[PDB]
Amino acid sequence: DNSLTLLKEGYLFIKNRTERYNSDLFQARLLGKNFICMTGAEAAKVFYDTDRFQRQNALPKRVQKSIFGVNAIHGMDGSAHIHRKMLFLSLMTPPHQKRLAELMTEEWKAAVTRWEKADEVVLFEEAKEILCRVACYWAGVPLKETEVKERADDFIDMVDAFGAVGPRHWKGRRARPRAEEWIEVMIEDARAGLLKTTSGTALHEMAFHTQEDGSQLDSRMAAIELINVLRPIVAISYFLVFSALALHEHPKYKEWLRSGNSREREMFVQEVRRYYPFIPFLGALVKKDFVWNNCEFKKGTSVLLDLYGTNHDPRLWDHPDEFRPERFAEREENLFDMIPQGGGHAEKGHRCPGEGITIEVMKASLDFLVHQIEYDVPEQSLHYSLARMPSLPESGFVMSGIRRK
Ligand code: HEM
Ligand SMILES: CCCCCC/C=C\CCCCCCCC(=O)O
Ligand SMILES: [Mg+2]
């Protein structure tokens, strides 16, 4: 069993071995199970074949009890999964992406009034609070100013736990029942009409969603699925910090952004998502015996798809370990070569329905940093680990001398 080695190597565990064995797949004992680990765009296509792969019983209990919730969308298959996935997709269309991006812009502009007076700020901490306030407001979830930071911390504790052991994992295990109880009473109040809800917002649509047989979700399950909207919006915090890091470490792109418009901002944001680590891999179970790439996949075998390694595959990407947003000028759009938030079709599998929200929030936040304020980046540890999952520049990205531009 290689699980401790996986903990040691993190994002590079699969890529180190696919390179060493000169193969796009290898066998390994991980998580107590027999696994095949695979990488590359062709492997991602096979992974998203839902006749060959299922997610039920692929999600380790420890992941359900920390980041995702028990028996939630991530572990569902078949028409029941697709049914629930349409609920998430309806909440993440461009009107929602635009609304969230606009709320973020308003928050960043409002933040300058305090940042200019305090001089020094930790971007990760500011982002967490703003995103939590914006996510709850857009969703219709009441949120008191005195609890913004606690709820944001609970959301991040769940994200930060998914690849951890020891105290960091325990933080996520403790935060999940707090968040679920908090949101569940909201669901219950909404269903009794004791909390005002609005058609087309996340609280309303999760509270009143009906399944294929016409029954509502259990209030706890509706709460879990609403957290599966609120938590990943706060998780955009990680990408916002990596975006600011890339700006600092590749300063030639700042004037490139200042001169240009949303096209350059979008190429920059896509390169942040491709280049920096966030989700290392995905798990599934072989649904039926099949053969691919001269390997027999036996029913019941667990499988890991390498997100990070595919995103740095030199067969797909020129100089894959350099940050070069211009690579997305005149590049073909494809569902399997660029998979930091999954691959394939979100309507037909488990691909992230939040990609558009992620991208527009990142673009709005990049615009703020480039056009709205000036700032310095003082001496600090900007190192981010490829072993620690998820990963973040250690300091959280400290900014100082902040001035209204
Ligand atoms: C912040 C950066 C984000 C990253 C790195 C990310 C990444 C991912 C990945 C890798 C998956 C699983 C894909 C698969 O299993 O095939 C996923 C699923 C999901 N994401 Fe995201 N995501 C992010 C943001 C968001 C946002 C902002 C939302 C909602 C507003 C969201 C909602 C979801 C949901 C509901 C699923 C489960 C979909 C399903 O099982 O069918 N995510 N995400
Ligand atoms: C058997 C190994 C399973 C894979 C372990 C990690 C699983 C999924 C990674 C997270 C997917 C969604 C992340 C978006 C952010 C969030 O939901 O908080
Ligand atoms: Mg229904």
- Using a 6 Å cutoff on CB, does residue 104 contact ligand 1? no
3-class DSSP assignment, residue 127: helix
DSSP 8-state assignment for residue 311: H
What range defines the domain where residue 267 resides? 1-405
Q: How far is CA 313 from CA 16, 41, 310, 326, in A?
A: 12, 9, 5, 17
Burial of 272 (0-12, 13-18, 19+ CB in 10 A): buried
- Cβ-contact 188, 263 below 8 angstroms: no
- Using a 6 Å cutoff on CB, does residue 50 contact ligand 1? no
Ligand nearest to the CA of 59: 2
- Nearest residue by C-alpha to atom 6 in ligand 1: 341
> Which experimental approach was used here?
X-ray
CA 3, 337, 290, 294 dihedral sign is negative
Resolution in angstroms comes to 2.0
Query: Residue 37 forms beta bridges with which residues?
Result: 26, 304
Could you give phi then psi for residue 138, rounded to 5 degrees? -65, -35
CA 405/CA 241 separation, integer angstroms: 20
Q: Which two tokens stand for residue 100?
A: 């969230």
Ligand nearest to the CA of 74: 1
CA 349/CA 306 separation, integer angstroms: 17
- Planar angle of CA 79, 200, 224, nearest 5 degrees: 55
- Nearest residue by C-alpha to atom 3 in ligand 2: 283
Q: How far is CA 403 from CA 34, 166, 369, 376, in A?
A: 55, 41, 11, 10
3-class DSSP assignment, residue 122: strand
Place of tokens 């349409």: 86
* 245 Cβ contact partners less than 8 Å away, ≥ 6 residues apart: 276, 382, 384, 393, 397
CA 40/CA 38 separation, integer angstroms: 7
Q: How far is CA 299 from CA 1, 49, 284, in A?
A: 20, 14, 11
249 alpha-carbon distance from chain centroid: 23
Largest CA distance in the chain: 63
**How many domains, in total, are found in the chain?**
1
- Cβ-contact 87, 222 below 8 angstroms: no
Instruction: Count other Cβ atoms within 10 Å, centred on residue 83.
Output: 14
- Using a 6 Å cutoff on CB, does residue 276 contact ligand 1? no
- Cβ-contact 323, 249 below 8 angstroms: yes
CA 238/CA 170 separation, integer angstroms: 20
